[PDB]
RNA sequence: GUAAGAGCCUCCUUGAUGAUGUCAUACUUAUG
RNA sequence: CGCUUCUCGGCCUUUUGGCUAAGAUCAAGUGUAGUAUCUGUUCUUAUCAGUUUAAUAUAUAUUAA
């Protein structure tokens, strides 16, 4: 214990010098000369390694701090001009320009990043930040055109349709949800459109779209796809004909009735709901 | 997995996906943290150019310094949320170390020892 | 203007090796992390450095098995870059012209580390379980030592119990021999300083150090692991060992014991290594004069032949088992002397920062190593000869036979082989072959030789340098002489041993 | 640019000012276009792969024949990926260490 | 001798050094030798060896091994798993006998403390001269800029620095438009009032006053204040 | 996929603090390799008899 | 024992002491 | 029980820059100057006092309790 403790005391006394913070911001332009020496040290540190991330980030923080706009925009513009890939750094510089009081060149710079590599990360995230900042109808329009241009999405598309739906009206978000769901059909998209259409009242186009979507997506067996929607609209509207048709179509499913417990718990749910008791439901 | 729904509740997350996950949960927490607004009055400011995604004019007048401060508030909120990472959580035990690098080597050494 | 060759080409090969390894390492994980790939160059780089440069496998727990397997592949390629180039360096050293010092002794030391990893590789790998025991030939050799020491009738006196002043004279003579060979004063280090302090303390108290070494070796086990070295002599390595001063003085009293008492007991074949003489006149007048003194040696009308076979030794450490020294050395000399002696051969080898423990072979040098190899080649020398030829070379028990003759002309009569000897590593042989005997064995080895006609250089051939134009071209009897070399191989034919 | 031409150095002197076109004896591009090399190589490998072809002294010994009939145990021609020993470094280390 | 101080200092020297180094600890252990330090360390001070008791059921296999072993102790030491060839031979001797029966300390402590402090000093004489050059350069700049500020505050007569070509800073750098800033345009237009407002708020951000802007200083002071008092109260 | 630490080996002039874990190396620093066979035991019994 | 560098030819802060000289020992010198 | 604020606790991320032959080796001759640990001697002051307030004249002077 005396060896480790002695190493703790000697290590604690091994620090080299305290700071000498004297004459802080004094003698008028002398502070600007100290800022010129510090900016020179940062320029030499960024000069030692052209691939340096850290030093560039510190030059961006100290820049935006003491360099106001011009020289700060020169640091973010030089580092941004020296960085093509690794768009996360472009998101750091975009966040530094977003904190400025202008924000016009920050939004236009966000559009320049949209024309740049989208990465499907900083484009949707930065687009959501700009749209949340201002330009509701415009930001959702360019974000919907961009997201509708290169590839579809899942959490970004569903979250974009949710934010566009809660914004003002769900009318346009219904057609956009039908186009996005039609671009990448799946059971989750049918359940989402059936849930939003369920909270939308209606349900005529939700049931017709449920049968039409269940018919076009049929390949091997329905299982959690059609039976979940048939039970949702069934138990929602309390229709025995839809429960009997769903139970009849579920019995025709291949691959050992598709999922065992799924169709069993669903047939027991609609069974117990509709009639149950003995006789038929017992056999 | 789960696509979308209408609800707000607690979750777990905080997992390896990192950037994409923290940005999705950060945008969802930011959107759910900010409710709707006066856009009905902007519904008077609404007229004929709304739909037709491809835009004729993407700039116009913006809004005002109002939306500038209201835009600066979530920036400071994201700065305060970014300022939360871990705590000091220190003590005097076992042997000594040298600055940060020895503590990082102690954490990685503890990660390699337990397997 | 890069690639200056010299030693700079290796640095560019290592940097370029770490270059493509960074691109492939970045292409190993589809997403992963960015900064996490930069630190992997240090773990894989240094892990390959100490990995290939040392005997440690350098296995990382929870490592990226695909990346560790790729860096292990390219790491083995880097080892090949230090392998074939080292083979070209050894060719450019011995055969080629030497260049300065650094590069020369450097590559010689890398090749020495390769020989250490090879000797430790066969040591640990092959020496763990099955190292060519051959219990049949081991029992046959046990009977060969049984009847051999029986008819020899020597005594295995374990240690002198301080009988007379000759023991003290052997201690002062051994200390004067170790101090004489080890005595020089320039620079050096605590090695020669501990040898000087042990020399002054040894000469100061001869009885204290004598009893301390006697009870030491006769009681305590082997000392700490010693070192070794191999210089570049333009020869095969340069076998050498660095031993502690305690085992050095114990080796002085030991070697003085087995040596001295061995001379008092007078246990040694008449044909053997040099003893108290000069090799050039010994082999000169012995082989030349005794060969010329043989009956009808150089004069043979017909049917008579002479076979002179000079065969060096091979792999003095090939024993690989301490049981031969246990039984053989123990019953031949002592239980404690062979105990600690065989324990000294189990010391772990240490070269530079690498430590390779090999107990198979013995040290490059030691106290009884002389008598060790003398008993090895002495027992194995009677394997080819046999109790007949060795019984003829023995002679009367009172006065044994001479070097070049035994009794009258019965030496060559009862021994179809004229003579033979083993001098240090080398050996010589002389025989008289009868036309019926050389035809018989020529037909046996001829049937054992798988070819009707064509005969290559085989065992013995290509004697040129000194009698360039005076040598023999070839003959059918020369092919019969190669079949006679096969008759010497099969004549000895040890199951598991280092052979000609 | 229109600059950076000042002084020369060695190895930059005029060299190989006249190139060498392919002669009709070595390689002709038209002959390679009309070449039969598919069937010519099929027939070449067809020929090469077609033909490949090519006593009291002895009783007094306490031992007997030990190593006999063991030859091919050491492969004459073997290419080993391991450069540590194999065939090469076995005799190389055997000759350089003894 | 192999005292406890040499064992602790040898363990710390093995932690900050490693098994690869030998004569380093020997130089730190004064009269001790590298061969004795490696032999005694690997034989005893190495935690890999188990010196605590033994297993009577597992020790029976070492006897039959010893029957197949004799001599060849170093070859059978890893086979036993406990190593310690001296302890193995001593245990075999005890089993055979049982079967047959039926000032300098303070100087070494100061050298060890200076050895560990030297281990934390591994930065070297290059980093030491860099630290002395940084503190001496900061003191010379504080004194030169000090007296220069005292002279500039009184009299208006002063020369300008030194030779203007290059310098101890970035070449030509006087941080107004330092390094290429390129340029940015939004869409087919020249934004004027926006850049003027960004420059107005830019001039509003910078203000004249007295203060010191730092980062690691407040973090180190906060770590010292947290280490001094946090909760305590015992119980 | 992750980057483990690096210890032991050589150099290590920086970060001299080593809460062990460096001397652990990998596994048990080797294994029984070829272990042992009955040849040495049978030869030892033949030497005893 | 010595390669390199530098310049002069208009407004604030958390309260732990000191002066009478000598040995074993550690480090720094081209004077031995 | 829900929401807001404050206090304490737990987890994720927190990062040793190259190579060849351990890269190469290992002890104290004396001599001058300087620096480097530790011991028997003492112990306190919150005071100086020439207050305050109001009015007038140019911090000072005068008048009124």
Swiss-Prot record, chain A:
Subcellular location field: Nucleus; Nucleus speckle
Protein origin, superkingdom: Eukaryota
Tissue and organ distribution: Widely expressed. Highly expressed in testis. Not detected in brain and lung.
Repeat (HAT) residue spans along the chain: 33-65, 67-99, 101-133, 135-166, 168-199, 201-236, 238-272
Subunit structure: Identified in the spliceosome C complex. Present in a spliceosome complex assembled in vitro containing CRNKL1, HPRP8BP and SNRPB2. Component of the minor spliceosome, which splices U12-type introns. Isoform 2 seems to be predominant in the spliceosome complex. Interacts with PPIL2 (via the PPIase cyclophilin-type domain); they may form a trimeric complex with HSP90.
Function description: Involved in pre-mRNA splicing process. As a component of the minor spliceosome, involved in the splicing of U12-type introns in pre-mRNAs.
Homology family: Belongs to the crooked-neck family.
Protein name, UniProt field: Crooked neck-like protein 1
Parent-record interval covered: 190 to 472 of 848
Curated annotation (Swiss-Prot), chain D:
Gene coding for it: CWC15
Residues annotated with Phosphothreonine modification: 25
Assembly notes: Identified in the spliceosome C complex. Component of the PRP19-CDC5L splicing complex composed of a core complex comprising a homotetramer of PRPF19, CDC5L, PLRG1 and BCAS2, and at least three less stably associated proteins CTNNBL1, CWC15 and HSPA8. Interacts directly with CTNNBL1 in the complex. Component of the minor spliceosome, which splices U12-type introns.
Record InterPro entries: Cwf_Cwc_15
Family recorded in the similarity comment: Belongs to the CWC15 family.
Biased composition (Basic and acidic residues): 30-54
Protein name, per record: Spliceosome-associated protein CWC15 homolog
Stated role: Involved in pre-mRNA splicing as component of the spliceosome. Component of the PRP19-CDC5L complex that forms an integral part of the spliceosome and is required for activating pre-mRNA splicing. As a component of the minor spliceosome, involved in the splicing of U12-type introns in pre-mRNAs.
Compositional bias ranges of the Polar residues kind: 2-12
UniProt organism field: Homo sapiens
Pfam families membership: Cwf_Cwc_15 (PF04889)
Superkingdom of this protein's organism: Eukaryota
Curated annotation (Swiss-Prot), chain E:
Protein name: Cell division cycle 5-like protein
Region (Required for interaction with CTNNBL1): 160-166
Record field: compositional bias (Basic and acidic residues): 207-222
Disease: A chromosomal aberration involving CDC5L is found in multicystic renal dysplasia. Translocation t(6;19)(p21;q13.1) with USF2.
UniProt motif Nuclear localization signal: location: 125-231
Free-text function comment from the UniProt entry: DNA-binding protein involved in cell cycle control. May act as a transcription activator. Plays a role in pre-mRNA splicing as core component of precatalytic, catalytic and postcatalytic spliceosomal complexes. Component of the PRP19-CDC5L complex that forms an integral part of the spliceosome and is required for activating pre-mRNA splicing. The PRP19-CDC5L complex may also play a role in the response to DNA damage (DDR). As a component of the minor spliceosome, involved in the splicing of U12-type introns in pre-mRNAs.
Domain of life: Eukaryota
Family: Belongs to the CEF1 family.
Gene: CDC5L
Coiled coil: 103-205
Domain HTH myb-type: 1-47, 48-99
Recorded GO CC terms: catalytic step 2 spliceosome; cytoplasm; membrane; nuclear speck; nucleoplasm; nucleus; Prp19 complex; spliceosomal complex
Cross-link type Glycyl lysine isopeptide (Lys-Gly) (interchain with G-Cter in SUMO2), residue numbers: 179
DNA-binding region(s) from the entry: 22-45, 73-95
Subcellular location: Nucleus; Nucleus speckle; Cytoplasm
A Gene Ontology biological process term: positive regulation of transcription by RNA polymerase II
Part of the whole protein covered: 10 to 275 of 802
Region (Disordered): 207-235
GO molecular function, one term: DNA-binding transcription factor activity, RNA polymerase II-specific
Tissues with expression: Ubiquitously expressed in both fetal and adult tissues.
Modified residues (Phosphothreonine): 187
Swiss-Prot record, chain F:
Top-level taxon of origin: Eukaryota
Cross-link Glycyl lysine isopeptide (Lys-Gly) (interchain with G-Cter in SUMO2), sequence positions: 14, 42
Annotated compartments: Nucleus
Family named by the database record: Belongs to the SNW family.
Quaternary structure (record): Identified in the spliceosome C complex. Associates with U4/U6-U5 tri-small nuclear ribonucleoproteins (U4/U6-U5 tri-snRNPs). Component of the minor spliceosome, which splices U12-type introns. Interacts with SKI, SMAD2,SMAD3, RBPJ, RB1, PABPN1, MAGEA1, SIRT1, FOXN3, U2AF2, DAXX and ATP1B4. Interacts with PPIL1. Interacts with VDR and RXRA; preferentially associates with VDR:RXRA heterodimers. Interacts with NCOR2. Interacts with MAML1. Interacts with NOTCH1 NICD; the interaction involves multimerized NOTCH1 NICD.
Role noted for this protein: Involved in pre-mRNA splicing as component of the spliceosome. As a component of the minor spliceosome, involved in the splicing of U12-type introns in pre-mRNAs. Required for the specific splicing of CDKN1A pre-mRNA; the function probably involves the recruitment of U2AF2 to the mRNA. May recruit PPIL1 to the spliceosome. May be involved in cyclin-D1/CCND1 mRNA stability through the SNARP complex which associates with both the 3'end of the CCND1 gene and its mRNA. Involved in transcriptional regulation.
Protein name: SNW domain-containing protein 1
The organism of origin for this protein: Homo sapiens (Human)
Gene name per UniProt: SNW1
Residues of the full protein shown: 245 to 293 of 536
């Amino acid at each position: 214990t005396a060896e480790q403790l002695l190493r703790e005391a000697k290590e604690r006394e091994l620090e080299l010098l305290p700071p000498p913070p004297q004459q802080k911001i004094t003698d008028e332009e002398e502070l600007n000369d100290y800022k010129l020496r510090k900016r020179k040290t940062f320029e030499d540190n960024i000069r030692k390694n052209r691939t340096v991330i850290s030093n560039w980030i510190k030059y961006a923080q100290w820049e935006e701090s003491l360099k106001e706009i011009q020289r700060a925009r020169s640091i973010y513009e030089r580092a941004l001009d020296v960085d093509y890939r690794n768009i996360t750094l472009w998101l750091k510089y975009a966040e530094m320009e977003m904190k400025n009081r202008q924000v016009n060149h920050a939004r236009n710079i966000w559009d320049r990043a949209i024309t740049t590599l989208p990465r499907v990360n900083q484009f949707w995230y930065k687009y959501t930040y700009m749209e949340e900042m201002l330009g509701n109808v415009a930001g959702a329009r360019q974000v919907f055109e961009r997201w509708m241009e290169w590839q579809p999405e899942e959490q970004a598309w569903h979250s974009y349709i949710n934010f566009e739906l809660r914004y003002k009206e769900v009318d346009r978000a219904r057609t956009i949800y039908e186009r996005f769901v039609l671009v990448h059909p799946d059971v989750k998209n049918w359940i989402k459109y059936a849930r939003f259409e369920e909270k939308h009242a209606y349900f005529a186009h939700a049931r017709k779209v449920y049968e039409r979507a269940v018919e076009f997506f049929g390949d091997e067996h329905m299982d959690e796809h059609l039976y979940v929607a048939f039970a949702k609209f069934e138990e929602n509207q309390k229709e025995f004909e839809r429960v009997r048709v769903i139970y009849k179509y579920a019995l025709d499913r291949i691959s050992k009735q598709d999922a065992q417990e799924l169709f069993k718990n669903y047939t027991i749910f609609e069974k117990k709901f509709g009639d149950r008791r003995g006789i038929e439901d017992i056999i | 997995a789960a696509a979308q729904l209408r609800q707000y509740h607690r979750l777990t997350k905080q997992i390896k996906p990192d950037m994409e996950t923290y940005e999705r949960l950060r945008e969802k927490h930011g959107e759910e943290f900010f409710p709707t607004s006066n856009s009905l009055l902007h519904g008077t400011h609404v007229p004929s150019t709304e739909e037709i995604d491809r835009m004729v004019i993407d700039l116009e007048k913006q809004i005002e310094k109002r939306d500038k401060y209201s835009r600066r508030r979530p920036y400071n909120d994201d700065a305060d949320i970014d300022y939360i990472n871990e705590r000091n959580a220190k003590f005097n035990k076992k042997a000594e170390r040298f600055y940060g690098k020895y503590t990082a080597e102690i954490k990685q050494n503890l990660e390699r020892g337990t397997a | 203007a890069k690639t200056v060759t010299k030693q700079r080409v290796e640095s560019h090969f290592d940097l370029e090796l770490r270059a493509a390894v960074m691109h492939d390492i970045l292409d190993m994980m589809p997403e992963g992390i960015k900064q996490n790939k930069a630190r992997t160059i240090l773990q894989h780089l240094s892990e390959a450095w100490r990995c290939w440069k040392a005997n440690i496998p350098w296995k990382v727990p929870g490592l990226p098995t695909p990346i560790e397997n790729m860096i292990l592949r390219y790491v083995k390629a880097k080892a090949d870059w230090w392998t074939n180039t080292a083979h070209y360096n050894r060719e450019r050293i011995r055969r080629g012209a030497t260049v300065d010092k650094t590069v020369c002794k450097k590559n010689l030391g890398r090749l020495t580390r390769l020989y250490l990893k090879a000797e430790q590789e066969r040591q640990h790998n092959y020496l763990k379980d099955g190292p060519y025991i051959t219990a049949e030939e081991a029992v046959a050799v046990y009977t060969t030592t049984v009847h051999w020491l029986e008819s020899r009738r020597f005594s295995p006196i374990p240690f002198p119990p301080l009988s007379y002043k000759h023991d003290t004279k052997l201690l002062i003579l051994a200390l004067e021999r170790l101090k004489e060979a080890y005595s020089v004063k320039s620079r050096l280090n605590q090695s020669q300083r501990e040898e000087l302090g042990l020399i002054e303390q040894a000469y100061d108290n001869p009885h204290e150090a004598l009893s301390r070494i006697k009870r030491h070796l006769l009681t305590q086990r082997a000392f700490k692991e010693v070192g070794i070295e191999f210089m570049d002599l333009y020869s095969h390595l340069v076998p050498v060992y660095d031993v502690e001063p305690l085992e050095k003085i114990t080796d002085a009293y030991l070697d003085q014991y087995l040596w001295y008492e061995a001379d008092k007991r007078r246990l040694f074949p008449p044909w053997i290594k040099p003893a108290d003489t000069e090799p050039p006149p010994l082999l000169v007048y012995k082989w030349c004069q005794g060969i010329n003194n043989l009956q009808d040696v150089w004069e043979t009308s017909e049917g008579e032949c002479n076979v002179m076979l000079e065969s060096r030794f091979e792999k003095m450490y090939e024993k690989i088992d301490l049981t031969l020294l246990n039984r053989l050395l123990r019953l031949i000399v002592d239980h404690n002397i062979a105990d600690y002696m065989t324990a000294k051969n189990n010391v772990v080898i240490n070269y530079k920062d690498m430590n390779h423990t090999n107990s198979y072979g013995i040290i490059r040098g030691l106290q009884f190593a002389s008598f060790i190899v003398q008993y090895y080649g002495l027992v194995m020398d009677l394997l080819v000869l046999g109790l007949h030829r060795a019984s003829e070379m023995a002679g009367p028990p009172q006065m044994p036979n001479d070097f070049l003759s035994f009794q009258d002309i019965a030496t060559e009569a009862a021994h179809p082989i004229r003579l033979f000897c083993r001098y240090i590593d080398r050996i010589h042989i002389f025989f008289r072959f009868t036309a019926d005997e050389a035809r018989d064995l020529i037909q046996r080895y001829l049937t054992e030789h798988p070819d009707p006609n064509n005969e290559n250089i085989v065992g013995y051939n290509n004697k040129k340098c000194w009698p360039r134009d005076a040598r023999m071209r070839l003959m059918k009897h020369d092919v019969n002489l190669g079949r006679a070399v096969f008759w010497d191989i099969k004549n000895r034919l040890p199951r598991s041993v280092t052979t000609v | 640019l229109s600059q950076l031409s000042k002084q020369y150095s060695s190895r930059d002197l005029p060299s190989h000012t006249k190139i060498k076109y392919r002669q009709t004896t070595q390689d002709a591009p038209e002959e390679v276009r009309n070449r039969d090399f598919r069937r010519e190589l099929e027939e070449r490998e067809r020929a090469a792969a077609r033909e490949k072809n090519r006593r009291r002294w002895d009783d007094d010994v306490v031992f007997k024949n030990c190593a006999k009939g063991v030859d091919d145990q050491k492969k004459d021609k073997r290419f080993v990926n391991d450069t540590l020993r194999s065939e090469f470094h076995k005799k190389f280390m055997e000759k350089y260490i003894k | 001798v192999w005292r406890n101080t040499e064992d602790e200092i040898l363990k710390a020297a093995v932690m900050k050094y490693g098994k690869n180094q030998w004569s380093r600890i020997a130089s730190l252990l004064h009269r001790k030798s590298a061969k004795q330090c490696k032999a005694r360390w690997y034989e005893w001070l190495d935690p890999s060896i188990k010196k605590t008791e033994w297993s009577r059921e597992e020790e029976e296999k070492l006897l039959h091994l010893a029957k197949l072993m004799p001599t060849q102790w170093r070859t059978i030491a890893p086979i036993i798993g406990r190593t310690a060839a001296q302890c193995l031979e001593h245990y075999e001797f005890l089993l055979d006998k049982a079967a047959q029966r039926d000032d300098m300390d303070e100087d070494e402590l100061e050298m060890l403390s200076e050895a560990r402090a030297r281990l934390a000093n591994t930065q070297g004489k290059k980093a030491k001269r860099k630290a002395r050059e940084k503190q001496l350069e900061e003191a010379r700049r504080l004194a030169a800029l000090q007296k220069r500020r005292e002279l500039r505050a009184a009299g208006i007569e002063i020369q300008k620095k030194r030779k203007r070509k290059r310098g101890v800073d970035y070449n030509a750098e006087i941080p107004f438009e330092k390094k290429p800033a390129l340029g940015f345009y939004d869409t087919s237009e020249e934004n004027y009032q926006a850049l003027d407002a960004d420059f107005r708020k830019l001039r509003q951000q910078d203000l004249d006053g007295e203060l010191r802007s730092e980062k690691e200083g407040r973090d180190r002071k906060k770590d010292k204040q947290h280490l001094k008092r946090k909760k305590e109260s015992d119980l | 996929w992750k980057i483990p630490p690096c210890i032991s080996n050589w150099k290590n002039a920086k970060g001299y603090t080593i809460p062990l874990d460096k001397r652990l190396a990998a596994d048990g620093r080797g294994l029984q390799t070829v272990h042992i066979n009955e040849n040495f035991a049978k030869l030892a019994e033949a030497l005893y008899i």
